[PDB]
Structure formats: structure tokens, C-alpha cells
Design a protein around this ligand. Sequence first.
Ligand SMILES: Nc1ncnc2c1ncn2[C@@H]1O[C@H](COP(=O)(O)OP(=O)(O)OP(=O)(O)O)[C@@H](O)[C@H]1O
Ligand SMILES: [Cl-]
Ligand SMILES: [Cl-]
Ligand SMILES: [Cl-]
Ligand SMILES: [Cl-]
Ligand SMILES: [Mg+2]
Length: 175
Amino acid sequence: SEPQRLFFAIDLPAEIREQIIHWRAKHFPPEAGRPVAADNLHLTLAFLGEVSAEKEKALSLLAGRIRQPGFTLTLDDAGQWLRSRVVWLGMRQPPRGLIQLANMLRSQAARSGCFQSNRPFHPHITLLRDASEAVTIPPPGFNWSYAVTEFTLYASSFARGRTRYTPLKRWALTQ
Ligand SMILES: Nc1ncnc2c1ncn2[C@@H]1O[C@H](COP(=O)(O)OP(=O)(O)OP(=O)(O)O)[C@@H](O)[C@H]1O
Ligand SMILES: [Cl-]
Ligand SMILES: [Cl-]
Ligand SMILES: [Cl-]
Ligand SMILES: [Cl-]
Ligand SMILES: [Mg+2]
């Protein structure tokens, strides 16, 4: 019925999310940029844009065909992209499983008509937006490492000046 704005993502366990926001607060004054709400911290795998109900169902079926092992993420990197004005967390050497999962979902989208940026996948978790000015970036905190067991399809909506993500479907990572 409803045409929705969709994306696939990896989520953060609550403890790591709490560590990230504490570290962010400690190292980045309000002036440095607009903080992403704690609940909204995530790692995007594929952005689908505006998707019809019929297209969403077809993409969800394809997502449900994916078979691959889970993997461990360890966030050992942080940086700023002036181009899109964000400060982010990431990995120096992302696990093969993450790259493969992202490529798979993007490939499924593209083959389904959903335009995908030719820009090489750069997995990241945005912490600050509208960070239009260069700022000092400390290394991430110690031991921000966890097992990824699932990925999730989200819908994105905006009202009241706050963006909300609503989970639609989840899939476990299984061989
Ligand atoms: N054109 C795009 N290409 C790749 N990823 C995108 C694109 N647009 C959005 N995303 C990513 O998909 C996720 C959802 O984005 P969306 O634009 O719906 O909400 P948002 O960026 O959090 O909120 P807002 O755009 O209102 O500030 C975000 O992680 C975003 O960075
Ligand atoms: Cl937010
Ligand atoms: Cl950087
Ligand atoms: Cl981003
Ligand atoms: Cl720096
Ligand atoms: Mg956006």
C-alpha cells in the first residue's frame, strides 16, 4: 500500500552503542556537528531509495536467499569525510563477509532496477552529520568488537525534525 524509503543495515549491540556515544560526547563538542541519535547508529549495507510494496516484496525474497556465515566486526578506525560532511567509525580491513554481504544486496537491488552508486562500498557508521569543518579525530575506543548475527531491512521516515528508522524484516546469517 505504502511506497517506502528503504535500506539494509547491520546494527550495533547496545553496550557498544553506549560506548560509542560516551566517546563521541567526550571528544566532540556540539560545535563539531550534529550527533546521530544513539538509536540511529548503524552500518548501511545498501540504500534502496523509494520502493513500491511489490518491489519491496521481491527484494525481501532475494534477501532471504542469502546464505553466508556471520562474522566479527572490530571498529578500529575513525575519520571525517568533508565531501558529505560526516564523521564516522569504520574498519581498516573490513572482513570479507561484510563486503560480500553488501555486494550481494547491492547486486540484488541493481538487478531489480534500484540504482546503485558506482562508488566502492566504504562500510562506516556515521556519528556526526553537518560536520562541514575539519576536526581532530581520535582513534576509536578499545575493544569495540562484536559478532554480527543478522542483517535488517529498514524503512526511513522523517517528521518533527527527527529521522526514524523502523525495522521491517531481519535475516540471520547462516551457511
Ligand atoms: N543516495 C544514497 N546512497 C547510499 N546510501 C544512502 C543514500 N541516501 C541515504 N543513504 C543511507 O541510508 C540510510 C538511510 O538514509 P535516509 O536518507 O533515509 O535517512 P538519514 O540520512 O538518516 O536522514 P536524513 O536524510 O533525513 O538526514 C542512511 O544511513 C544514509 O546514509
Ligand atoms: Cl539521528
Ligand atoms: Cl579522516
Ligand atoms: Cl553516511
Ligand atoms: Cl584528526
Ligand atoms: Mg539522507
